[PDB]
Amino acid sequence: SRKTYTLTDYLKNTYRLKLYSLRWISDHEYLYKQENNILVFNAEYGNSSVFLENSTFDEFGHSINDYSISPDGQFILLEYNYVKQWRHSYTASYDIYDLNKRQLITEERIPNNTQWVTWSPVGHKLAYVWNNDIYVKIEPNLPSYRITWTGKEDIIYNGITDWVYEEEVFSAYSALWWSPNGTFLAYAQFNDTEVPLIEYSFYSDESLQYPKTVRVPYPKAGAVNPTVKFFVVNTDSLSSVTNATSIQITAPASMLIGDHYLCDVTWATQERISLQWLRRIQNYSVMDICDYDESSGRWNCLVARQHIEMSTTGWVGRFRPSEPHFTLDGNSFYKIISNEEGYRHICYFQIDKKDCTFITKGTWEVIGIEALTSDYLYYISNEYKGMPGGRNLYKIQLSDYTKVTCLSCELNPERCQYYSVSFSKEAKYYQLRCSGPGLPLYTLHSSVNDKGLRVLEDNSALDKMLQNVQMPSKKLDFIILNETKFWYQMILPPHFDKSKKYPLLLDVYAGPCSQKADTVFRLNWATYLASTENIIVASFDGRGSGYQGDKIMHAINRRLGTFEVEDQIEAARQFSKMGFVDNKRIAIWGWSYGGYVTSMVLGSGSGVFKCGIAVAPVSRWEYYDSVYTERYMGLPTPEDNLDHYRNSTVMSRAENFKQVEYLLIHGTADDNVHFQQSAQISKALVDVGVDFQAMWYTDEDHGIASSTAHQHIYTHMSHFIKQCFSLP
Template sequence: MLSGDYKYIALESNYTKKWRHSYTASYSIYDRERSTFVTPVTLPTVVQYFTWAPTGHTYVNFNIFFKADVGAEAVQVTHNGKKNEILNGVPDWVYEEEVFASNGAIWWSSTAKFLAYLEFNDTEVHKVEFSWFGSEQYPQTVSVPYPKAGSSITKVKLFVVDTSNLSRRTQVVAPASVSSGDHILCSVTWVTDERVAVQWLTRKQNHVVVQIYDFDGSSWREKQVTYVPLPLFFAEDNLSFYKVMSDPQGYKHIHYVKNGKATPITSGKWEVIYISKLTRDAIYFVSNEYQGVPVKRNLYKLMIGGSTSAPQCLTCDLFPDRCQYNSAYFSSDASYYRMDCYGQLHPPPRVPPALLSNDSSMVNISILEDNKDLENILTEFQMPKMQYDMWYQLMLPPNFKKSKKYPLLIDVYGGPCSQKVNYRFKLNWGAHLSSTHGIIIASFDGRGSGYQGDEIMHAIYKRLGTFEVEDQITAVRKFIDMGFIDKDRIAIWGWSYGGYVTSMALGAGTGLFKCGIAVAPVAKWEYYDAVYTERYMGMPTDNSDAYTNSTVTARARNFKTVDYLLVHGTADDNVHFQQAAQISKALVDEQVDFETMWYTDKDHALGGSAYRHAYNLMSHFLQKCLHNPK
């Protein structure tokens, strides 16, 4: 991790994973000018979060500590931090997983004059407890504050500290329109050294306030309020901004927001995925506009400041035979960008970085990785062939013949705003099953999926477990109609939300599926975290019928006609083992025979040796199911 002045490098060691994004580590500081390590380090051996400031740095261990220089003594900024109760500068479980997707909640102003941080108060949040079996005589108990649907959620406060006088700490107060009830802080964006934009969200997550605050010398006062979602890219006036939001036709497009009025500057029946970079005269963004195909991603440049020209695609014609799913990472002044080409199944992708010059022409500087070695290796193997449609993708076995009948495996996720079908290079378990065992692997994006307009995405709002499940079943019938699917050898599998959809589809009692595999599935939405669940289902008290009708356990009796493999880690902090335990209990109550595998002390990802074991287990299960007569 390079310091802002490029003089020092923070080297990380003793990495210990906590949740999806968080971890603890030790840090050594290397002086680049002297070519030696800084001693003494004066950093704790266990640090929750480390960040360089534009000058100086901070670290976190439930409290925030500030060092003005690498050799300076650390000054404690906060003093009330306590495990599972108060966290400063690092998010609690639900904010890490569902809001920030990060292990830090610290934001420096551009010159490090101010440091903004969040205080997370979990004292009223119910805790989930699970056993960590380890190797000791007695298991340990892991306790995690985890707000479930309808329960008390985390309370947050935003503070700003003056780094020239660390005792000067000012709270940035939420606006009255959200502070009257439970609320969520979405993002913090420094506009200038003395202007900060904060996005506040009501608990229902149907009302977002962008509040801009100015420092008046003693406090942060409200400057302007706008009601739009995140994220924000501020214009040169440091008050107006650009952001991606739904247009009147229900497609995500870039809007210019000034004085509370949002004006779309892109339009069409396609979606802007995200803004990559904003400069004085242009916006660079990634969209799925090209050829009207939502499974593609390309980088575009749109001139601003009075220009009426259409967006220019910068990647559409670069390696069109292999690069139709791209992203870009820009240098600070947007003179250069690294283009990442995620390619298609065959041939494997290449990654051509490119130069953007002032006249919008591009010059490839160098190929950082062309994957030629991988391409040569893959020539020795029979690879499956991909077949795409706007809604589905099929992975067909080598030497596929339409006149034959093949077993079918539905690979599903199905969660809100997800996309399973895309032009990314895939060399995964499905490719192995297709090339080695002659199984067709199919994925389908139905109602509830993303990047095809709000009408499709919002179809499952407040009704999870309905249309996204029904559409997978409908897709199977369409695949059978293609003529090369053996209708007696059809399976479905998924992980997390995909495990939920798998279980709901098997429990629908259609007779279409011979078997299915659910890894870490949700059983009941009341058991899942409040931020995610209430975003799509509302509060249980306001939508009780939908909560009741969306459970896997209520469909347990229908599992008598299918083969079912249920897989879960006992230390899953995300979708708790409780979910699989409830499915198991319901199946036993209905006298259903099924197969299970619990992975001791493994979390949602089933890392380490469990990962390989799980895929071997699932492969054997599918071989029994799909290669034996029904």
């Protein structure tokens, strides 16, 4: 094949993976943008036409970042002046374009710097947040109605999340929820008045004379958390004269006695809202069912339909309590619950009755419930061949739980072992999406008899280009430590020769419920390390890893920095035994939790690792955020888990770093894992006299993703790995 997958190829995207992102707009049609045209496809027949021509806005003026078409296809939202904030948040400008008239709405426009915009599920109503306040427009061209007047920057958030709720709880900036009708608008309100601020310098452009201090309400472990409230407003009865009436739904009494979180909102019907609350000690959760009382106009949460979730061995759910999927009538629902043996399976709950009925069981887990029809429930699981790192679509016959059909397994067993799915409205069709081990495959199907309709993108263009390259192969297997199987993967150098000895690089994450050993196809830094530098890149899923039951996932409860660290070390020992690993050249690196684990490993004095790299690592759990840290570590108080908070830092292992070559990297504007974390690691090493290599990235955040920084850090790390392994 002559050539290899080079560093430049990775940094420059020489070999591009193609995708097929569609947007379902009904039971049978989806939108797709080919070039800069928006085409509408008919799923059954496959015909399409151009919905919006790439030239419709050539004279718009600004560069359009994104668009959003109303549910009734009458109007389209135009998103420009995009300015990113955190992982999900950002601000932008919006213009609405009438599809029937083919003209831009110019009256009662949406304000610049809008924080969030969303159409109603039906019709064409809009709800947006500006200045931390919620506004509503019944019609695109009509004046908006103000819903809240309490908005205040960095203090009161109406309709949007504060920093911690965005990152750790809702995984979104949005905090608004239209009802199926488009009648009610539910929204949460966060108050960060007593939440401490994390401050750090932002240097900006060279022209700025004085560095700017960024301040963000951020609750570190054990600090004051933000408080939350929930409201519901009737959108049909809005008046231009009187102020909107927001009905508040209060949290259960079992929640009010202390700090808690609103962790899930789900409309069950036009008049029933489901709410899940979580105590600050995340081992107790409550699901509330609230019904609208047409006569009084209020919402009542009967303590009859209250469903409780507790956990003795750990925390609730994988990262948070699971989402409930209601059947049409709203009287019952399904949700993933850890079963009697610690394995997560689908549960059937009937509103006003006790317990639930498990409809799936076994030594494997359900990853997620994807669709729910009158006859079947569709879900993704890692059941096939007992490979926790594989994923397939299955459907259960609701009138007979024993009848489970696998919908993806046999489609192409050698190329596709990791699917994800996207169903149309009412699930009449579904786009299957395979991520590996072979090249990504996108296909369309009809639900009726699960007939494959057509291929959407098979990545033939990439396949041909790679045939020209000496690509590395992937090995997915397991080792038995005690009586348990622990999975691992190895990116192996082309023309792999087990008689030879290769240097090994342990690529680490290892956080709670993580999975680094899977069947996914990836073109990344490790591909370059194996293809051009002949390095073996390995990952190992030890205790604490997810999707293999609680026995494995909860072994790390209240003890972060122990078993996951010991297991990475034991894995490298194991790999050494295999005659194809030069034990004098074993490195290790990781980003974020992987950075923390990597440092913890390097500082263990195990003698197994020559060098390692840690990027933006956590160094002391009291520095990281409350929702994430408290979930696994409890509170940093004497009565609780303060001792392990104190015995699990990277700083106390400083002396042992004199036995390795360490490279510590971190962005100065990191709002997630504060530069402080590395500032303290470096200081501990200086005080003990250990030499080490460092690199800061000015104004880069946790991702260090800007194109220049991205290219730079990977070039820097590559040089570091080559010199350590003596690879000119």
